[PDB]
Amino acid sequence: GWVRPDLGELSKVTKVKTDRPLPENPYHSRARPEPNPEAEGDLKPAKHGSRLFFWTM
Amino acid sequence: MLKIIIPTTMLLPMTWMSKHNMIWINATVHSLLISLISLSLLNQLGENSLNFSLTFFSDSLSAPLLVLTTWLLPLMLMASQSHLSKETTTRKKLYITMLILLQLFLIMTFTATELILFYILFEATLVPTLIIITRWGNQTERLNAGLYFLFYTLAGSLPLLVALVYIQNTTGSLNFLIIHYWSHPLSNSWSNIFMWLACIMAFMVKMPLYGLHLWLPKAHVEAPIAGSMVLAAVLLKLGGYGMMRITTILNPLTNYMAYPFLMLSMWGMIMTSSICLRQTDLKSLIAYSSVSHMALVIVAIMIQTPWSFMGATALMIAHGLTSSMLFCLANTNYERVHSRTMILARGLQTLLPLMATWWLVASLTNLALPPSINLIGELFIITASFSWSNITIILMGMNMMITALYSLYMLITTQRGKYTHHINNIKPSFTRENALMALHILPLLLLTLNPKMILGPL
Numbered sequence A: 001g002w003v004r005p006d007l008g009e010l011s012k013v014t015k016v017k018t019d020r021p022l023p024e025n026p027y028h029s030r031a032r033p034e035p036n037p038e039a040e041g042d043l044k045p046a047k048h049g050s051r052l053f054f055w056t057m
Numbered sequence B: 001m002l003k004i005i006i007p008t009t010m011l012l013p014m015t016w017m018s019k020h021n022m023i024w025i026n027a028t029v030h031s032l033l034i035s036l037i038s039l040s041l042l043n044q045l046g047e048n049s050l051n052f053s054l055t056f057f058s059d060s061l062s063a064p065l066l067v068l069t070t071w072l073l074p075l076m077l078m079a080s081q082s083h084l085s086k087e088t089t090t091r092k093k094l095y096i097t098m099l100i101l102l103q104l105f106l107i108m109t110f111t112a113t114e115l116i117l118f119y120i121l122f123e124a125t126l127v128p129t130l131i132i133i134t135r136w137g138n139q140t141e142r143l144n145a146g147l148y149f150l151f152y153t154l155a156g157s158l159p160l161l162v163a164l165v166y167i168q169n170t171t172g173s174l175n176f177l178i179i180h181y182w183s184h185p186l187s188n189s190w191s192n193i194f195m196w197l198a199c200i201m202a203f204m205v206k207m208p209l210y211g212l213h214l215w216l217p218k219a220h221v222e223a224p225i226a227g228s229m230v231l232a233a234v235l236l237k238l239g240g241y242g243m244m245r246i247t248t249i250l251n252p253l254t255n256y257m258a259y260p261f262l263m264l265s266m267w268g269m270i271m272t273s274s275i276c277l278r279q280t281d282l283k284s285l286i287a288y289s290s291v292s293h294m295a296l297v298i299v300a301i302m303i304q305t306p307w308s309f310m311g312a313t314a315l316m317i318a319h320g321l322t323s324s325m326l327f328c329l330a331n332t333n334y335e336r337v338h339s340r341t342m343i344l345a346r347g348l349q350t351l352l353p354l355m356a357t358w359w360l361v362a363s364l365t366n367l368a369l370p371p372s373i374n375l376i377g378e379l380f381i382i383t384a385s386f387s388w389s390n391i392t393i394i395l396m397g398m399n400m401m402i403t404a405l406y407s408l409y410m411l412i413t414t415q416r417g418k419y420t421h422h423i424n425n426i427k428p429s430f431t432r433e434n435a436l437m438a439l440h441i442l443p444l445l446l447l448t449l450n451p452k453m454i455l456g457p458l
């Protein structure tokens, strides 16, 4: 009672039921370094301007 | 102090919008008015300076220099309009523009609160002077003179710039008040020695120091009359003003870094005074005179005492007036006879008596006859040098003997003796020339009447 598969049936993406737990770190990755924290707060004008040599603005 | 700066910037378009035959009148009138306005800066305090704003301030050292600059502009205009009569209107306006720009740069230089702004203006003064010399000089040597004037200056000032920015990376400021209040001693290391040299050599070449002075006879001889006036009277004093400003951060290194410069100044003062005794060109004699007087000023600044600083200030003001007057006196004869050889025109007292009186008074102030401010500055410097070392009175003494000699020599060569027979084109003195001489000489004696106005902050 065997039926030959039709054209395009063996190439389907199927689903499988398994009791094997999904691995959590299959790449054996290290802990990622922490990023530079952030930019926060409101922007205020530069204190005393550019402060470049004699310029007061 | 924009009440002085803005009127000069207004002189600029006033000159460029004037009618073709009114440029000299308008320029002279408004220059004199600006000098009158600048006269108010002489009201100084005993404790600190007049701090007008974050950018400009006035001290008891810079106020007489500003007054001298603003007073010299109209005299330069009066002296220039004779030999520029054949010039086109546009070129005359360009010449007046150069003079005005030079005055503006000098005014801003003497009052800048920061050292880099001071450096920028003190280099900016180079361009109008070089243009005046190389465009309106009379002989072919002017071009060479211009080159000698430029690189001699820049080879001194480029290291200074580096030092300046280095200092701002170390102390955080170049403001002169902050620099004075937060002063720290200089240790004895090679780095500090080269910093001292970088801070000093530009002003040394500006004075100029003996051995670094070769640019000055060329530039001051080849220049037109206004160029020579402003070179001798004001531009040489930039070095002294800058040295007295910069020495506040160089202690106690100066205590022994001054020895080569002190030796050079004293011996070269003797040497240039001696050179004045054998000179065939009348303008070169006046230039070497300037070198000797500036050597005295260098000694005064290097020994770093209150009496020496007062003497240096008085000597700079007095020399400016006297040397400008002497250059104008020589220019009158040059315009008459078209030659700078001193022995060509002789016995001029017989032909021009009042001009001979002007010559006598100018040569009397050159040899520091008491109680002229020339003598006051010279005597203060000599007393301070005597305190520094009792042996200096030898060299200084010799200088006092030589100066008078060559001074009187000049007079005796030009005014006395018999007139040259074949020179028949000596016209009577114009009102303009007599007025120029009077406007030079009267302020000198008026300042003698009240000498504390030119004695500086000490």
Ligand SMILES: CCCCCCCCCCCCCCCCC[C@@H](O)O[C@H](CO[C@H](O)CCCCCCCCCCCCCCC)COP(=O)(O)OCC[N+](C)(C)C
Binding pocket: B188, B189, B190, B193, B209, B210, B211, B212, B257, B260, B261
């Ligand atoms: C034409 C006129 C131009 C303008 C004139 C400018 C004048 C510049 C002269 C510089 C003055 C002194 C500079 C440095 C101070 C001392 C120099 C040295 O001779 O003194 C001894 C230095 O010892 C030896 O002499 C080493 C220096 C020898 C090498 C320098 C070359 C000089 C030869 C002459 C070359 C000409 C230079 C000018 C070119 C125009 C002191 O012993 P020492 O205590 O250990 O050094 C002090 C510094 N410390 C503390 C950090 C160690």
